[PDB]
Amino acid sequence: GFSKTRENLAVIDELLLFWNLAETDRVLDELEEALLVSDFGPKITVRIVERLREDIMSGKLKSGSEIKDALKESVLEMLAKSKTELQLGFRKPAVIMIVGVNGGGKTTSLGKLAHRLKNEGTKVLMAAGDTFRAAASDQLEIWAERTGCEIVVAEGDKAKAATVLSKAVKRGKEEGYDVVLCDTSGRLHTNYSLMEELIACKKAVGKIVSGAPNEILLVLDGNTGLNMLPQAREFNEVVGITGLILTKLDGSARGGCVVSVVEELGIPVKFIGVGEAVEDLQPFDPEAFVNAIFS
C-alpha cells in the first residue's frame, strides 16, 4: 500500500538527520527532488518547499524532525481542507453511481465496494447501467454473484442507462434494499454524449427516491490521473462528483498523484484501488495516508 512511495520518500528522513541552518538550501533542493520523483505535482511541491523555507527562516522550524512534521502537515492540509466517508443518509435506498472513462475500473470498483457493504450487513442491489455491451452486464453479473448481490440488467440492447437505473432503484425500494450501486458507461468515443446520459440517469433515480444519487464516485486510474484532469473536471462540472476512486495504485511509487489530483480537483478521495482481488478497495483516510507514505 504505497510501499514503493514510502521507500522513495524515506530518503527525506536520512536528509533531515543532518540538517542545520546552513545546509537548508541543499536539504530542500533535494527534498523537492524526492517529492517530484514521487508524483507530487510541480505546483504543490513548490508551495510545500517554499512554505518549509519560510518557516525555517523565521525560526519556527529548528530541527530535522520539526521540518519532517511540517512537511507531513503541509501535505495533510492539501488533502483535507471535505469528508471522505460515504454519506448515505437514511432514506432507502441510498443510490451510488460509479462514473468515469472506460478502462479505469468502474465495474470492478463497484463489485469491490459491494463486497465491503455486504460485509457490513448492507443489502445491496447492483444496476447494470453500462448498456454498450452484453459483456458489460455479464461482467457485472459475475460480481453480483460472488458478493451476494442481486442485479438489474437491461431488457433489450438499445435500452437507455437511465431506464435500467430507474428500474433498479424502483426495485431496490420495493425489495427492501439499503443501497443500489449503479454501473455506468464510460465510452471514450464520447461522440456518444456520455455526460448527457449521466445527467439523465441522475434525474431518473432522483424521481424514485428524492435525494438520489447520494454519491457519484468518479473512477480515475491513479497512474494516468494527472493527464485527464480536464475530463475529470467535466464530470464534476456537468454531473456532480461527490468523491474519487483512484484505482491501480498497487504498490504505487506515485503516491503524490493522490495529493496532486485532490489538490487540483478539490474532490475528496474516498477509496483507493490497490489490486484486482475483491478486497483490494480500501477506504481513504488522509491522516493514515500521510503516515503511510512518510512513515
Minimum CB separation from ligand G4P for residue 235, in Å?
A: 13
- Which of Mg ion, ligand G4P, none does residue 273 bind (CB under 5 to 8 Å by kind)? ligand G4P
- Which of Mg ion, ligand G4P, none does residue 275 bind (CB under 5 to 8 Å by kind)? ligand G4P
**Which of these segments, 88-96, 154-162, 230-238, 274-282, binds ligand G4P (CB under 6 A)?**
274-282
- Could you tell me if 126 and 106 are in contact, meaning their C-beta atoms sit under 8 angstroms apart? no
Residue 273, marked binder: no
106 binds ligand G4P (CB under 6 A): yes
> Which residue, 140 or 262, has its beta carbon nearer to ligand G4P?
140
Residue 88, marked binder: no
Minimum CB separation from ligand G4P for residue 281, in Å?
A: 8
105 binds ligand G4P (CB under 6 A): yes
Among 5, 38, 45, 107, binds Mg ion (CB under 5 A): 107
Among 38, 102, 137, 260, binds ligand G4P (CB under 6 A): 102
> Which residue, 81 or 146, has its beta carbon nearer to Mg ion?
146
Residue 249, marked binder: yes
Q: Report which residue's Cβ sits closest to ligand G4P.
A: 273
185 binds ligand G4P (CB under 6 A): no
- Which of Mg ion, ligand G4P, none does residue 1 bind (CB under 5 to 8 Å by kind)? none
Beta bridge partners of 282: 272
Residue 92, marked binder: no
CA–centroid distance for 233 within its chain: 14
**Which of these segments, 29-37, 99-107, 190-198, 202-210, binds Mg ion (CB under 5 A)?**
99-107
103 binds ligand G4P (CB under 6 A): yes
Residue 24, marked binder: no
Residue position matching grid coordinates 530535522: 64
Q: After which residues is the chain broken (C to N over 2.5 A)?
A: 81
From the annotation, which residues make up the binding site for GTP?
100-107, 183-187, 247-250
Chain residues in the site for ligand G4P (CB under 6 A) = 100, 102-108, 186, 219, 247-248, 250, 273-276, 280
